[PDB]
Write a protein that binds this DNA or RNA. Structure first.
Ligand SMILES: [Mg+2]
Ligand SMILES: [Mg+2]
Ligand SMILES: [Zn+2]
Ligand SMILES: [Zn+2]
Lengths: 49, 277, 50, 1362, 79, 49, 99
DNA sequence: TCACGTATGCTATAATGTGGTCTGACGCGG
DNA sequence: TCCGCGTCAGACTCGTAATTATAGCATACGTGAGG
RNA sequence: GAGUCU
């Protein structure tokens, strides 16, 4: 997988309702990952590594 | 809450009083004189130093909490044998113990087959020599290049380098995911297979019948010497203890038993056939 | 030289082996003609034409 | 050695020391120079024993002269080296350490017993917080965690008034102080006042533990380990690699961590160091002990040098690579080999080619045994060299042993028992195994380099077992289906096909021959073709009413080749059998006919003779494969240009925005799928009847002798499907997803695919080959699960004396009868006395086998349905009776007592799933669904008979159906079901119920790519909970402005309109609701997700109009892969997401109160005046319309049935028929033949346990689920002797759960969950008495079934009589 | 008996009790050295045991009769 | 590899399931005969003794 | 490949694997179910004991076959004895409660 | 009483809280 | 509802065998042989 | 780790 940003989404794997939760991953060649993702209730969230 | 053993011990030693100059002397004064409170609060306080020394001596033998444990034992001996009468500091004196107790205990536990202090310290002289030789001989140094630098025996350099060879684990796979490891290949040579087991049963049950075949005085004298029927493997001279009581007649009768048996093996179909084996 | 099973073709659906065989036959057919003309020793202009 | 049973318990500190023969107090292994056991080391000789046999270390005492002598010097016993794997040891831990299996393995055991959370216990273990063990004044509560600050509070204030401590010491003292008798009483007495479900679940499980903990003789102290046992050295060996390197087990490395930290801990306790240091060491001890027992469980697993984690003790018991699955339920075997197999078409069916050098190494001991008897070798060493030199005398002796001495041949994968068959060896020249062609089908063995394993049955028992049971000639029929597996294929079919088939005149037409021998005479003489129509005199032997054969001579109008083939045919069969042109399907029936008429011997000879002549005449024919043989129809480019224009039309209308993307997608696939049919029909019409020949008359035609056609028509290899790709059209290719690519490949393999057509073809190629590698593991795991549950089941009894069975109606589904009654009921004991229609004389006895003779009489009298004795209905406690199972399908006769039905049943289900995952996947490229079921055409005249139907007449004048599961029958003259169809919802019927129809009439018509929502009342449409943006969306066009509305579901729906249900409410002209005729329901059809609506708000409607159109996108080609999950879920007994509701008790319905949309049903039965209430969701439109005489198990909500609700309300026979029909329908879609009895076997094991409701007179009482077999043995004694009868309810169980529910823990730990099974058995103190096959396979005993059946029951009478 | 063991099975009944009876008789000729009833015809002790069952000479009950005869004759020489 | 005269026709079931029937002449010509060079090492080590 | 009798593994005491080690053939649970299904329990017990682990079985049986007597004189696999000691080293009492 | 490998002992400038992989899935509890 | 833990076909063939780093010297402790 | 049969 190439480094850079790549937007992705769990379609109906996240949750029971089937809210397509969209996400992002900034992938470096060295260093920590940076994930941004929605929740069922459409709040934005951040997780590193 | 944090349920890791390491970050918990590190939290405990954190809230500990970092001692100053005549604080060390004040406690260590009553420590040598023998005080409950002094030995603990000197050791308790100086645990923070042990961790730093143990942190640098890592990825070598044990994990990390193991270096701290053996490091704490060196700090305890530093406290028992500190001299406050001397104007010199404790952190100077205790650094000698914590580097020492960790070095010396790693040497023993790091290896599966226990390697002693002499053989390891021998080896370190060869290893540090090897690094100096390697930078100017580009390629790694040979056992003769190391032996010839120190003017010491080639067998002695080979002996110690052979003990450095590490142990491969049985449960380690050659394959990858889950194919086969070394136990799945390596044979138990101590337990012989049915083919080799039944041959010694047939060889020895064949001999039990060939004993009854030869003459009554010949199979008595021959069997009890080799310890085949008797209890102890005696010699020509010791067969005299039974009834023979002879040195010459025992030797003539022993060989007479074997000569008649050599013709019994040439007729049954062995002799040169069973000579290869 | 070899006798293969024809029932190993329709199921497999690898018909290239049969086109290879037909063309391989044609290829040897030219070889066997040139082999015959070299044994007969006809003419360099004749080998040139064929 | 011999014993009765095995028991598991906790190890007491006292018990651990009993096993130990010395304490390992040092981590040292060996001295680096003098390689010996170290002083009280891990490999100590003083403790575990000497390295050599009868030799001490120092070497003072050697050999057996000194028998039981312990050396004074080194301290080592002069005994065998065997003692090194047997003697254990111990370590006296300075501080207690919790056992990780009795802490982490949930339920926590230590936590469940203390009623104290696992989180709370871990805080005490890692020394974060104190726990009060016994607070003297109850100010400090028991089992209350105090933080390090909160401990300092009580310390100054109270002090001795409380005993709160920390570490494993505290949890052990906490387990010591607790009284099981006093707390158990309290839990019982305080459950009465509340009585809920999860309290009564957890408090009853705590009672079951406390009671089992006392009776097991276990103490809660032993949850925490004070002593740590050591494994024997040989079991964790330090052995030398050839070179000077050594190698060691990972346990040695984990033991060394534990000993180092334990010895250091003792020294730091000696030094009276601060507690901070002591705590760290106690934490590290817990870590090293927990890592020794189970490495990867509590925290990060301790990695060694390699970076992988160190393998722990638990690891060598747990899972696949554990002792169980790899070194105990399966083994490496002596007197075994393998090689590349090849054909042996000269061989007989009872033979196999076994190489010289293989057989020499295989039969070594038997040769040494003959060499001593013939007097050629004096000793074994002498005999060894004679064989090694390969002397001429030795080949002759090898030949002598092998005669009449069978060998077993095996192939991977061993899917069913026929994967191993026995043969008499034939020594051959080369190094390759020669396999008999006819058994190739059972092995699935093609010669393209397969390898087959060889096994020698050594013992005389094994030689007889090989010859009597496992011989190839004994195993002809499949155990899965009563049909021969030994069936000619490939060249053999093609050869008999070429022989029998006739042709116009040919050489020598209309001749007259004396016999079948003169036909061979004119063929070999070259005066007649095999295809010449000729009159021949043939004498056929037909069997009389008695055993005697009657001879009958007659002139027969058959070809020369057909006369020659009669010579192979044994006497007993009619000549009519060889008078047709024979293909594979007919030749299979020839050996099935012959098997039932004549016997085993004739079939084995007949099958061979068919093989020989079949190969020979195939070779004579010179049938071949050329490029000209792949004829393409001349009218292919015509069909494609028409079909291209049709598809271009929908794509041009899509640009206009008339047809949608989904509609075009399904509509385009239907055009191309019918074009592929058109091209293929043109191809097979221009291929089959292409031969037009000139007879001696003028001109006529016959079937083509195109070589490829013969190969596919005969059924030798290929089919019409494959020929499409060769000559016709390649077709729609399948996406890796499963959905169908919109562009199909026009071209074929003869014409050649272009660059893109190939690239499209690869999508479907890789996905097929992908399932061959990956998805086989889901399927093969089913085989495994099915075997573990059915394992123990064996025929125990001849006749149970039960009068019960399952009523088997014939599977008439989808026009043609899919499975006759005859096939389904064949080989089954007649449960009830089933006579002929006129109930006045019995036709068949109650206790009698169903032979083909009786089955033929069933068709004469037209028996419709027959109650048949089933496996499920058996009242045998021990296993099953012979009568209930009936005929062994493999043998064609009554099943024997002792034969293991469970494993045979699991294999027959598991095999076709597993092998078909590899079959139409390597072979598969193209997609070929035809799910375009537009209309039912009835074929015979009949009266229309609908059932479970509620329709309503529309404006058009057409009977529109408004019920989901509507069925359409076809009733004949006398009154019996001939054809059956599924009419769907919103379908238009041609004629209503009871009306006559002719043959070839469209009786029903509908749109397949849409599920309409149809009304039951007329008036106007109202929009309710249909807000734009929240629940629905809107899109308009141009000039006028036609907008469509699309209903959003929870996926495309905001949090605003989640609890809003969108529905098209019906109203009248005034604006009020319209009541549905004869009900208090205002008319309201709830629209589901993605429901497209054309009519907007304020539109006039009649009854029968379509309100909305729900899309029906299912373009996936159903192979085994999509159906197996269904089969897995049925056997695992899973409720679906939307189970249909069923009536629990028979009686008068009254509808009740409502909860903001959700319905209640306070139903009050006629007899049971006490009510039964149950909540129902809002959106479920009910089938029952309230106030009605409803019985047990009546479909209230439409939808899928939970198998639990079936067994609970409608008994065992209902749920059995649900599983059999539902599972078997999946296998029937794929053409897989599995008898119902095999599914019924596993269903029986699913219906194993039963929950006891009412109290008994033993110790069942209430809530305790026990096996069915056990409670019935009690009920037998209760009905006679008296006391409280135990009322019961049979419960349904999934496979994975029923396997773990078995009392044999050795069966359970060998299946899965090894870590959990062993701990739950250890704490209960369970004893496994070795019941089933797994248990005896493990311990290395005779199976308690099959040949050993007789032996195990002989031991069981020794146990009874004294 | 050579290939086909159906006639031997038809005479006893059970395929499993057939292997047990045939093995019992095979072991008599293997160790005890009993003489065969059918001509040997150069076959293994396993096949002789099947042949004798097929013809109706060896059986679970017949073997118990003959075992009691040899056993009790020697018991009578004792008593 | 090598090219050779191949006839597609069945033969007494010796080409049953992709089983191949080859002439003696192909074996005689040693044309499908393959060379296999094989490496075996003999090591004198140093044991304790 | 072919093998009658050969080397045995260290802990399991089963035959080795493969021609590279001159090893016997693996009789897996798949292959075990086949003989289970037939009924041939002697064929199976042979392959579970005297052909595999049973140490007294394998040497004794070799001698029985050379004596001519195709006698089943079995015992109990060493791999089970290993299972017992591995479970007892876990701190779990597992014992053979006899007749 | 030495010979020999093995083990324990002490070094006084000051020094005082640690630092490899990042993506499975479908089921079923608590 | 989310975190945790548990399963995931059957044999076969080959192929190889890695790395780091621990100071230096003086008395103390144990066993065996020689005077 | 690269293969062979399914
Ligand atoms: Mg094939
Ligand atoms: Mg193959
Ligand atoms: Zn000794
Ligand atoms: Zn029954």
């Amino acid at each position: 997988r190439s480094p850079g940003v790549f937007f992705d989404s769990d379609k109906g794997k996240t949750h029971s309702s089937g809210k397509v939760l969209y996400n992002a991953r900034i992938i470096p060649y060295r260093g920590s990952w940076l994930d941004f993702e929605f929740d069922p209730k459409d709040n934005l969230f951040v997780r590193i590594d | 809450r944090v349920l890791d053993a390491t970050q918990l011990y590190l939290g405990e030693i954190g809230y500990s009083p970092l001692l100053t100059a005549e604080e060390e002397v004040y406690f260590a004064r009553r420590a040598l004189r023998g005080d409950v409170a002094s030995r603990r609060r000197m050791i308790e306080s100086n645990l923070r130093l042990v961790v730093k020394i143990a942190r640098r001596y890592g990825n070598r033998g044990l994990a990390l909490l193991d270096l701290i444990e053996e490091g704490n034992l060196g700090l305890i001996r530093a406290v028992e044998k500190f001299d406050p009468e001397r104007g010199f500091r404790f952190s100077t004196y205790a650094t000698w113990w914590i580097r020492q107790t960790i070095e010396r205990a790693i040497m023993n536990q790091t290896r599966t087959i226990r390697l002693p202090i002499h053989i390891v310290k021998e080896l370190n002289v060869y290893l540090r020599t090897a690094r100096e030789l390697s930078h100017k001989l580009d390629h790694e140094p040979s056992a003769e290049e190391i032996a010839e630098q120190l003017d010491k025996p080639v067998d002695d350099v080979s002996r110690m380098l052979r003990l450095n060879e590490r142990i491969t684990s049985v449960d380690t796979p050659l394959g990858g995911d889950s194919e086969k490891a070394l136990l799945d290949i390596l044979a138990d040579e101590k337990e012989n297979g049915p083919e080799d087991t039944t041959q010694d049963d047939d060889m020895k049950q064949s001999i039990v019948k060939w004993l009854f075949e030869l003459n009554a005085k010949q199979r008595e004298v021959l069997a009890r010497r080799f310890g085949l029927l008797g209890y102890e493997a005696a010699t020509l001279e010791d067969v005299g203890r039974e009834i023979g009581l002879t040195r010459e007649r025992v030797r003539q009768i022993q060989v007479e038993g074997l000569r008649r048996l050599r013709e019994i093996l040439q007729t049954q179909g062995l002799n040169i056939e069973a000579l290869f084996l | 030289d070899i006798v293969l099973n024809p029932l190993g073709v329709p199921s497999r659906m690898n018909i290239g082996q049969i086109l290879e065989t037909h063309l391989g036959m044609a290829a040897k057919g030219i070889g066997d003609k040139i082999n015959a003309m070299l044994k007969q020793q006809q003419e360099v202009a004749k080998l040139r034409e064929f | 050695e011999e014993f009765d049973a095995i028991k598991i318990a906790l190890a007491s500190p006292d018990m651990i020391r009993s096993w130990s023969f010395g304490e390992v107090k040092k981590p040292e292994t060996i001295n680096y120079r003098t390689f010996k056991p170290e002083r009280d080391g891990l490999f100590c000789a003083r403790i575990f024993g000497p390295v050599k046999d009868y030799e001490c270390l120092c070497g003072k005492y050697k050999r057996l002269k000194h028998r039981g002598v312990i050396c004074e010097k080194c301290g080592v016993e002069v005994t065998q080296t065997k003692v090194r794997r047997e003697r254990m040891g111990h370590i006296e831990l300075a501080s207690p350490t919790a056992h990780i299996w009795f802490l982490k393995s949930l339920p926590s055991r230590i936590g469940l017993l203390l009623d104290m959370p696992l989180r709370d216990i871990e805080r005490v273990l890692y020394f974060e917080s104190y726990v009060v063990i016994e607070g003297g004044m109850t100010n400090l509560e028991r089992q209350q965690i105090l933080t390090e600050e909160q401990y300092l509070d009580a310390l100054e204030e109270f002090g001795d008034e409380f005993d709160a401590k920390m570490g494993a010491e505290a949890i052990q003292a906490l387990l010591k102080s607790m009284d099981l008798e006093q707390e158990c009483e309290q839990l019982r007495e305080e459950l009465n006042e509340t009585n809920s479900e999860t309290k009564r679940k957890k408090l009853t499980k705590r009672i079951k533990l406390l009671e089992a903990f006392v009776q097991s003789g276990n103490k809660p102290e032993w949850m925490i380990l004070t002593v740590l046992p050591v494994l024997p050295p040989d079991l964790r060996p330090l052995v030398p690699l050839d070179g000077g390197r050594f190698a060691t087990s990972d346990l040695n490395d984990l033991y060394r961590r534990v000993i180092n930290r334990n010895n250091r801990l003792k020294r730091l306790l000696d030094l009276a160091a601060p507690d901070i240091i002591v705590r760290n060491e106690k934490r590290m001890l817990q870590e090293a002990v927990d890592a020794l027992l189970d490495n990867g469980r509590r925290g990060r697993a301790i990695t060694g040098s390699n970076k992988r984690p160190l393998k722990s003790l638990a690891d060598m018991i747990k899972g696949k690579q554990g002792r169980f699955r790899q070194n105990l339920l399966g083994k490496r075997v002596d007197y075994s080999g393998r090689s590349v197999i090849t054909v042996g078409p000269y061989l007989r069916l009872h033979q196999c080619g076994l190489p010289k050098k293989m057989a020499l190494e295989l039969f070594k001991p038997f040769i040494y045994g003959k060499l001593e008897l013939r007097g050629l070798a004096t000793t074994i060493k002498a005999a060894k060299k004679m064989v090694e030199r390969e002397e001429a005398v030795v080949w002759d002796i090898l030949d002598e042993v092998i005669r009449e001495h069978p060998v077993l041949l095996n192939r991977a994968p061993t899917l069913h028992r026929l994967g191993i068959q026995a043969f008499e060896p034939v020594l051959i020249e080369g190094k390759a195994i020669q396999l008999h062609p006819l058994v190739c089908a059972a092995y699935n063995a093609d010669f393209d380099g397969d390898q087959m394993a060889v096994h020698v049955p050594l013992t005389l028992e094994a030689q007889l077992e090989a010859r009597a049971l496992m011989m190839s000639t004994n195993n002809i029929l499949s155990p899965a289906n009563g049909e021969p597996i030994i069936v000619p294929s490939q060249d053999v079919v093609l050869g008999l096909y070429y022989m029998t088939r006739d042709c116009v005149n040919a050489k020598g037409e209309g001749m007259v021959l004396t016999g079948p021998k003169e036909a061979e005479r004119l063929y070999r003489s070259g005066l007649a073709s095999l295809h010449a129509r000729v009159k021949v005199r043939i004498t056929e032997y037909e069997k009389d009413a008695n055993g005697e054969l009657v001879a009958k001579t007659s002139l027969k109008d058959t070809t020369v080749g057909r006369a020659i083939l009669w010579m192979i045919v044994p006497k007993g069969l009619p000549y009519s059998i060889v008078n047709q042109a024979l293909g594979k399907k007919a030749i299979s029936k020839m050996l099935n006919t012959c098997y039932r008429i004549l016997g085993l011997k004739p079939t084995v000879i007949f099958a061979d003779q068919i093989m020989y002549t079949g190969f020979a005449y195939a070779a004579r024919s010179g049938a071949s494969v050329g490029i000209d043989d792949m004829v393409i129809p001349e009218k292919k480019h015509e069909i494609i240009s028409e079909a291209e224009a049709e598809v271009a039309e929908i794509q041009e209308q899509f640009q206009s925005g008339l047809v949608t993307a989904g509609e075009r997608y399904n509509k385009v696939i239907d055009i191309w799928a019918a074009a592929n049919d058109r091209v293929s029909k043109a191809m097979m019409d221009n291929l089959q009847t292409e031969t037009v020949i000139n007879r001696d008359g003028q001109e006529e035609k016959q079937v083509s002798f195109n070589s490829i056609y013969m190969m596919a028509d005969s059924g030798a290899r290929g089919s019409a499907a494959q020929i499409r790709q060769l000559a016709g059209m390649r077709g729609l290719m399948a996406k890796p997803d499963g959905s169908i690519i919109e562009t199909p490949i026009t071209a074929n393999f003869r014409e050649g695919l272009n660059v893109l057509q190939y690239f499209i073809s690869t999508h479907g190629a890789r996905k097929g080959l992908a399932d061959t590698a990956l998805k086989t593991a889901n399927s093969g795991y089913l085989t495994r699960r099915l075997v573990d549950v059915a394992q123990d089941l064996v025929v125990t009894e001849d006749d149970c004396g039960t009068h019960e069975g399952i009523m088997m109606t014939p599977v008439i589904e989808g026009g043609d009868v899919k499975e006759p009654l005859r096939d389904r009921v064949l080989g089954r004991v007649t449960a009830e006395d089933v006579l002929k229609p006129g109930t006045a004389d019995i036709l068949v006895p109650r206790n009698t086998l169903l032979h083909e003779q009786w089955c033929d009489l069933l068709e004469e009298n037209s028996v419709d349905a027959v109650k048949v004795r089933s496996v499920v209905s058996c009242d045998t406690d021990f296993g099953v009776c012979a009568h209930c199972y009936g005929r062994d399908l493999a043998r064609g006769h009554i099943i024997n007592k002792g034969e293991a039905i469970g494993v045979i049943a699991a294999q027959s289900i598991g095999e076709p799933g597993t092998q078909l995952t590899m079959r139409t996947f390597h072979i598969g490229g193209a997609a070929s669904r035809a799910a375009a079921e537009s209309s039912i055409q009835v074929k015979n005249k009949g009266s229309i008979k609908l059932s479970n139907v509620k329709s309503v007449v529309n404006s058009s004048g057409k009977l529109v159906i408004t019920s989901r599961n509507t069925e359409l029958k076809l009733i004949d003259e006398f009154g019996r079901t001939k054809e059956s169809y599924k009419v769907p919802y919103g379908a238009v019927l041609a004629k209503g119920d009871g009306e006559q129809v002719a043959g070839g009439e469209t009786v029903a018509n509908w749109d397949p790519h849409t599920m309409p929502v149809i009304t039951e009342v007329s008036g106007f449409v109202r929009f309710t909970d249909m807000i734009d943006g929240q629940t629905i969306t809107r899109q308009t066009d141009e000039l006028t402005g036609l907008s469509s509305l699309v209903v959003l579901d929870s996926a495309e729906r905001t949090a605003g309109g989640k609890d809003l249900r969108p529905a098209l409410k019906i109203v009248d002209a005034q604006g009020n609701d319209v009541l549905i005729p004869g009900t208090d329901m205002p008319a309201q059809y709830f629209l589901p997700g993605k429901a497209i609506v054309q009519l907007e708000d304020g539109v006039q409607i009649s009854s029968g109009d379509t309100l909305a159109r729900i899309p029906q996108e299912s373009g996936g080609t159903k192979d085994i892969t999509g159906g197996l999950p269904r089969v897995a879920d049925l056997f695992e007994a899973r409720r679906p997401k939307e189970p249909a509701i069923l009536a629990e008790i028979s009686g008068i319905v009254s509808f009740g109160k409502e909860t903001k949309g959700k319905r209640r049903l306070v139903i009050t039965p006629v007899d049971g005046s006490d009510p039964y209430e149950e909540m129902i969701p809002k959106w479920r439109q009910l089938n029952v319309f309230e106030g009605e005489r409803v019985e047990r198990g009546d479909v209230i909500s439409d939808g899928p049935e939970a198998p639990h609700d079936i067994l609970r309300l409608r008994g065992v026979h209902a749920v059995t028929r649900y599983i059999v029909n539902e599972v078997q329908d999946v296998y029937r879609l794929q053409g897989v033949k599995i008898n119902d009895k095999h599914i019924e076997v596993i269903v029986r094991q699913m219906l194993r346990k039963a929950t006891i409701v009412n109290a008994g007179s033993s110790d069942f009482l209430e809530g305790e689920q026990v096996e069915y077999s056990r409670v019935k043995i009690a009920n037998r004694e209760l009905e006679a002797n008296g006391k409280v009868g135990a009322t019961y309810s049979r419960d349904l169980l999934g496979i994975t759960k029923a396997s773990l529910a078995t009392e044999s823990f050795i069966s359970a730990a060998s299946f899965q969950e090894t870590t959990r099974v062993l701990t739950e058995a250890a704490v209960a103190g369970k004893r496994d008495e070795l019941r089933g096959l797994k248990e005896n396979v493990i311990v290395g005993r005779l199976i308690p079934a099959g040949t050993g059946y007789a032996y195990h029951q002989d031991r069981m009478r020794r146990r009874a009589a004294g | 008996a050579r290939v086909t063991v159906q006639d031997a099975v038809e005479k006893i009944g059970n395929r499993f009790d057939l292997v047990l009876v045939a093995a019992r008789r095979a072991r008599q000729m293997q160790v005890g050295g009993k003489d065969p009833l059918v001509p040997e015809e150069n076959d293994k002790t396993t096949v002789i045991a099947l042949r004798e069952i097929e013809e109706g000479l060896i059986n679970n009950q017949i073997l118990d009769v003959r075992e009691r005869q040899e056993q009790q004759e020697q018991e009578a020489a004792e008593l | 590899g090598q090219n050779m005269r191949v006839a597609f026709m069945p033969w007494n079931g010796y080409n049953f399931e992709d089983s191949i029937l080859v002439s003696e002449r192909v074996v005689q010509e040693d044309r499908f005969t393959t060379i296999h060079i094989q490496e075996l090492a003999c090591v004198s080590r140093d044991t304790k003794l | 490949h072919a093998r009658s009798t050969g080397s045995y593994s260290l802990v399991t005491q089963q035959p080795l694997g493969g021609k590279a080690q001159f090893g016997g053939q693996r009789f897996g649970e798949m292959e075990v179910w086949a003989l289970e299904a037939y009924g041939a329990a002697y064929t199976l017990q042979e392959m579970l004991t005297v052909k595999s682990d049973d140490v007294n079985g394998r040497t004794k049986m070799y001698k029985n076959i050379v004596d001519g007597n195709h006698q089943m004189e079995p015992g109990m696999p060493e791999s089970f004895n290993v299972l017992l000691k591995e479970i007892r080293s876990l701190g779990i009492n597992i014992e053979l409660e006899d007749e």
